[PDB]
Structures are given as structure tokens and as C-alpha cells.
Design a binder for this molecule. Sequence first.
Ligand SMILES: CC(C)CCC[C@@H](C)[C@H]1CC[C@H]2[C@@H]3CC=C4C[C@@H](O)CC[C@]4(C)[C@H]3CC[C@]12C
Ligand SMILES: Cc1cc(C(F)(F)F)nc(Nc2ccccc2-c2nnn[nH]2)n1
Length: 284
Amino acid sequence: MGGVIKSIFTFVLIVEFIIGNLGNSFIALVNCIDWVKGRKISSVDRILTALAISRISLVWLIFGSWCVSVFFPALFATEKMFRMLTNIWTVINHFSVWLATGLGTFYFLKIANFSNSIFLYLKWRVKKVVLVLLLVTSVFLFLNIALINIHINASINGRFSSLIVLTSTVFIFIPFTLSLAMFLLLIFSMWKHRKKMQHTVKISGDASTKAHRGVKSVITFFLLYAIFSLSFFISVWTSERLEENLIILSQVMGMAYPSCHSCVLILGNKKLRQASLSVLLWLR
Ligand SMILES: CC(C)CCC[C@@H](C)[C@H]1CC[C@H]2[C@@H]3CC=C4C[C@@H](O)CC[C@]4(C)[C@H]3CC[C@]12C
Ligand SMILES: Cc1cc(C(F)(F)F)nc(Nc2ccccc2-c2nnn[nH]2)n1
């Protein structure tokens, strides 16, 4: 039972390593080709290639951790490698997820339309706001590193993964909840605008270019939020309840976001979709 489950999870980890490496490499490579072949780069493209680089680093960290654990368990048992892997993972993961929330704040401040004065003050200073969001949220990183190191010291003075995983998962929930709140507020703004443009102005005489192209991105984004909050709840409940196969499952769950969210980001950027179509054209 345990052996076939571990084999299935190993196959899952190999598949998601392949998908994540291919997707994030595709994002970074497309932006790099567009940069070297004399073309303009938007700010969204810079944030996207920052996410791609960070997610390549994170998926390589977890795959290298799995390679070290499988090939050299004696090396894996040491406290030095464990503490080094834990701290490097938490730094890279904090940077990656807060860059994703920064991209979400960029979308929300650029697109959404509200009458609040504070919202407009943030709305006309988007670059300053995302830079401040990256710099201020380092207090979360310092407190996370502190609490993980306290847990490591307590474990080696009493390896306590049942609290390490819980602390890390709590520290991923805050940017996820901020991104979900910004997404819901953007959807509410678009719905209010649609209700306004459906009763004063007779919609359009064309009715072609509108949110009818963005509903595909909204649908493929809300699907990812649903199927990832489900896996949030499943992983937290299973890690809390009784599991003793925690390492491979947690190594699988840590690679889920940087592998699937890049594929979601491909389906939803016009440049990335055009590059994917050109790749599928010249491959044939
Ligand atoms: C948000 C939730 C569902 C997923 C978050 C992923 C976290 C909990 C996972 C992803 C990679 C994992 C690490 C991968 C490798 C090791 C080495 C081993 O000694 C166990 C602990 C440690 C250090 C793991 C701790 C938990 C970990 C950091
Ligand atoms: C692919 C895509 C399309 C759309 C759109 F349909 F609205 F255009 N929106 C998003 N995202 C967000 C929107 C608001 C707040 C946060 C995010 C966010 N969360 N994570 N990354 N960005 N994404």
C-alpha cells in the first residue's frame, strides 16, 4: 500500500517537475528572445520573467532535494543539509509567492475602477506600491525564518515536520488570501462596470473586444484557485491527522504552485499565447 502510493507520488513529482521546468523555461526564454531581438518589454513581462526565474530556482531546489534524499540518505539525515535546505527554500519561496502577489497587485491597481481616494493614490503609483509591498513584507520573511529556526532548535534539542510544514503553509496563506481578495475586488469592479454599461449605454454596436476575451483567463484562473485551495485543505488535514510518509508528499505539494501557475500564466498573456502558437506552428 505504502510502496505503490510512494511510486504514484514519485511519478507525480517527475511529471510536475517536467511541466514546471518547461513552462517557466518557456516564459524566461520567450522574454529573453524578445529582449535580444530588439523588442519592447512591458513591466508585466519583467514581473513574469522574475516569477519564471524564481520558480525555476524553487523547482530545482525541490528536485535536487529529492535526488539527494533518494541517492544519499546518509547525507540527507544530517542536520546541516536539513537546515540549509529549509532556510534556502523559505527564502526562495517567500520571494516567489510575494512576487506573484505583486503581479496580482499590479493587475488590480491597473485594471480596477473605484472612486476611493486611497485606491486612486495607490492606482497612480503602481511601481512604488509593488516595490514597497516587496520590501515591507520582508518582516514576514524574518519572522518565518525565526520561527522555523526555533522549531528546528526545539526538534534537535528534544525534524518536527508536523510543525515545520504547518508554519510554512500558514506563511503561504497570507499572500494567497491577499491575491484572492484582489481578484474578487477586480471581478466586482468589472461586474459593476458591466452593469453600468448595460443600462445607460446600449452595450456596443460591435460587441467583439471587451471582457469576452478576458473571461477565458478569469475562468482558467478561478479553476486553479479552486483546485489549489482544495489541495491546501487536503494537505493540511493529511499532514495534521496521521501521515508518516510526509517527505515525498510535501515535496510534491511544494512543487504544485510553481509548476501549474506558470501554465496558467501562459494561458492568459497575449505574448505567451502567441509564442505558444508560433511554437506549435513551426514544430509542424
Ligand atoms: C502550502 C503547502 C500545502 C505546501 C508547502 C510546501 C512545504 C510545506 C514543503 C515543500 C518542500 C518541503 C521540504 C522539502 C525537503 C525537506 C527535507 C526533509 O528533511 C524534510 C523537511 C524539508 C525541509 C521539507 C519541509 C516541508 C517543505 C518546505
Ligand atoms: C491570468 C489572469 C487574468 C486576470 C483577468 F482576467 F482579470 F485579466 N486576472 C488575473 N489575476 C489577478 C487579478 C486580480 C488580482 C490578482 C490577480 C492575480 N493573482 N495571481 N496572479 N495575478 N490573472
